């Protein structure tokens, strides 16, 4: 249904990016 946004945000935090749920998939952006 929908991705795990809190876990996804913490995954991108480790890379210095922001995490977002996009079509049942976790993705990061620079910002």
From Swiss-Prot:
Domain of life: Eukaryota
Pfam families in the record: Toxin_2 (PF00451)
Chief location: secreted
Tissues expressing the protein: Expressed by the venom gland.
Subcellular localization(s) per the UniProt record: Secreted
Comment field on protein domains: Has the structural arrangement of an alpha-helix connected to a beta-sheet by disulfide bonds (CSalpha/beta).
Protein family according to the UniProt entry: Belongs to the short scorpion toxin superfamily. Potassium channel inhibitor family. Alpha-KTx 05 subfamily.
Remaining remarks: Negative results: does not show inhibition on KCa3.1/KCNN4 at concentrations up to 50 nM.
The protein, known as: Potassium channel toxin alpha-KTx 5.4
Lineage of the organism: Eukaryota, Metazoa, Ecdysozoa, Arthropoda, Chelicerata
């Amino acid at each position: 249904a929908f991705c795990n946004l809190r876990r996804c945000e913490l995954s991108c935090r480790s890379l210095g990016l922001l995490g977002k749920c996009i079509g049942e998939e976790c993705k990061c952006v620079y910002n």
